[PDB]
Design a protein around this ligand. Structure first.
Ligand SMILES: CN[C@@H]1[C@@H](O)[C@@H](O[C@@H]2[C@@H](O)[C@H](O[C@H]3O[C@H](CN)CC[C@H]3N)[C@@H](N)C[C@H]2N)OC[C@]1(C)O
Ligand SMILES: CN[C@@H]1[C@@H](O)[C@@H](O[C@@H]2[C@@H](O)[C@H](O[C@H]3O[C@H](CN)CC[C@H]3N)[C@@H](N)C[C@H]2N)OC[C@]1(C)O
Ligand SMILES: CN[C@@H]1[C@@H](O)[C@@H](O[C@@H]2[C@@H](O)[C@H](O[C@H]3O[C@H](CN)CC[C@H]3N)[C@@H](N)C[C@H]2N)OC[C@]1(C)O
Ligand SMILES: [Cl-]
Ligand SMILES: [Mg+2]
Ligand SMILES: [Mg+2]
Lengths: 275, 272, 274
């Protein structure tokens, strides 16, 4: 019966006894998510009394164009409802998928979370909204269709599903681990990652615009092309091992600011933590 | 022409009232004009046919306790899903589309633009696939909307040269393309409507492929531009498949012969 | 504030009529319509009404309706949710000049709003799925941008200072916004990198799927990932003539008087080539 929306996860932490002020045309899905909370359609809004929910990105453009929005802080005081992959200051869940802090993605990757193709997405990871993650259909039967199964009776379905589960090429991502997407990852526009054949986008990996990723991407590799190939690595092997031990992406806010100089300068990072 | 929803209601509404689940639109109210309808409150499949307006509306309906007795297509549909699969052969802007065949808004647009002659049965097209034609490449300009400034005589001269162009700008002077049955087309794939007339039965078009020429039956093509990497089956089994046309079988026949559909070795034994 | 496409068109063509809204209104639309008299469309007449279709789907509904028969595009009707749609006059898109008969989709509107685009020329055709984005910084320990939401004032200043000095222009810092020329074509799923591109030359053709990482010369055709020059549309001498003549700045009268040279490059060179 429908898991927790991003908006509900935010309102549970930040509403703080205010009323939700809906900026835009309310939808069936929004009204259901708002049932636990006091809400009304927005007119004059004040962050002391109101939490502003823009329904669509279009409504958010309008809200942020309004003089009233000046005193509203992102996430703390306002959000967009139709933004399930939007970044948040806290770790959360997108369907059954853990998502780290300040990590964002778009509708294709939200769907991949819904489909079970993703195990988790790390911290401080930036995924262009047009990136896509999908699986392969079966390639070892007479047909390649999936929706033919809407015509299968109980006995036919059983035989079909049995064969799918034994296929070592993992059609529909069967019999494989869902993919882990690391921290400090960047994925470009129109990139594609194949969920039948990829289990790992390593920490720090960069996926170029338009890349077609068919196998795992090592940590801090930069991959480009159709099919994607490793073009370079962001850092030396010694610094990659250092990054994988330090895991700055799990630091507290205090520590991130404490060490902003090492985050900004790789040379300083190596002097401090490379031992 | 008739929307997907109107085709479905003509088949299955069976004298019920349409219960609109979500905010109604101009397009929806026009599609519902010959039918009785009301905004949904309490619904029951004996009295109501539920129309979720958007995909998000459908998510909310299918999460609701009231949806348990509603069967897909027989009792509910999404209005904004012109490319959605159906258990019967339908029309998409008077493009014939086979059973259990789905595609995204780009291919819906290609149907509306006249680029597609028909789409076969059991064909799976990822929602981000695109089908577009080329502009003219043999004039001083490549713009199309410059024509909004052409008077009647200039327009006629422009239109006549486009018609004579062997490279088929805007898919002029060529057949709209046939997309076969049991076809798979992956994400961000592109098919050029100026230069493609046939995606053969059984073809597989890889994610990101840019298809500039016809794809033979059961060819697997990948790359920019798309090249044949392999065929799915031997020449002998392709000939058998193109005769048998299992994609035209009844539901009874599909279940009767599920073993041949699961196992290509058994299909060849049985039919080849 | 900045004027929507609709507001600019109404200021030009409304001519004292009343706006007849066709479709479910939005908060964006109602704000744009505040200077004007408007009502929900019922019976409409282009002598009396200017029809605003809210969505593309609303427009399809309106144009299928018998009442639309005498309505002329732009002069009498428009789609609100079509900020990159073509117009017969030069307009602004989020304070970016856009030439006549030039269209583009929501990715390029976004790039206008983000400050990535200086101007877009006349008679330019950009597929709806084209994208224009910048690079993140590539010279620090992290590639994330939204880590900066955790930066205090001191940390943010140190971060912004390095970004400003980066010669590779992360987030399009310290570079000119890009000019997109006239009579340009940009295909489906094309990508143009705003960190490293300042010019798409007049006449350029960017093929579908192309990933454009550097300037595209005038009348060059580029394809692939990354994008490379496939061919030029015309000879060097004709390119030089086209850049002199600038037919894309001609009046409607000049376009029609010279349609033979616009259709035939040979005739263009005969009339304008030295
Ligand atoms: C669902 N809506 C999202 C939309 O909200 C927005 O998401 C932004 C994303 O574009 C930003 O980042 C992008 O744009 C920045 C300039 N604004 C420069 C850095 C770039 N990666 C992230 N920092 C925050 C997301 N909420 O753009 C992508 C999208 C998919 O349209
Ligand atoms: C208009 N909405 C459609 C949306 O309903 C959906 O369409 C699905 C399509 O993704 C499914 O298939 C896809 O996803 C499956 C797991 N859910 C695995 C197989 C894969 N091809 C088809 N079986 C049915 C369509 N109606 O995804 C594409 C879309 C364009 O967003
Ligand atoms: C915001 N809506 C726009 C939508 O209006 C439409 O835009 C068309 C564009 O596709 C047309 O052109 C395209 O389609 C033509 C057949 N219709 C063939 C030529 C091709 N470049 C331009 N001539 C006019 C724009 N308003 O398609 C793209 C879009 C992004 O969906
Ligand atoms: Cl936007
Ligand atoms: Mg038969
Ligand atoms: Mg004169």
């Amino acid at each position: 019966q429908g898991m927790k929306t991003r908006l509900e996860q935010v309102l549970e932490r930040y509403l703080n006894g205010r009323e939700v002020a809906v900026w835009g045309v309310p939808t069936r899905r929004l009204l259901r998510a708002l049932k636990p909370f006091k809400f009304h359609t927005a007119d004059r809004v004040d962050p002391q009394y109101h939490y502003v929910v823009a329904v669509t990105d279009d409504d958010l453009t309008d809200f942020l164009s309004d003089e009233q929005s000046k005193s509203f802080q992102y996430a703390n005081d306002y959000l967009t409802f139709d933004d399930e992959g939007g970044e948040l200051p806290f770790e959360r869940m997108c369907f059954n998928v853990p998502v780290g802090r300040q990590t964002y993605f778009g509708d294709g990757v939200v769907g991949a979370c819904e489909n079970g193709y993703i195990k988790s997405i790390g911290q401080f990871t930036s995924i262009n909204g047009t990136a896509e993650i999908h699986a392969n259909h079966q390639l070892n039967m007479t047909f390649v269709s999936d929706d033919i199964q809407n015509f299968f009776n109980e006995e036919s379905m059983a035989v079909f599903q049995e064969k799918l589960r034994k296929d070592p090429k993992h059609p529909y991502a069967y019999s494989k681990e869902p993919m882990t997407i690391g921290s400090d990852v960047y994925i470009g526009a129109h990139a594609f990652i194949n969920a039948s054949t990829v289990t790992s986008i390593g920490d720090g990996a960069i996926i170029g615009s338009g890349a077609v990723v068919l196998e795992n991407v090592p940590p801090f590799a930069v991959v480009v092309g159709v099919p994607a190939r490793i073009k370079r690595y962001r850092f030396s092997k010694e610094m990659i091992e250092t990054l994988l031990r330090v895991k700055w992406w799990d630091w507290s806010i205090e520590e991130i600011n404490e060490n902003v100089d090492a985050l900004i300068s790789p040379e300083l990072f190596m002097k401090k933590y490379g031992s």
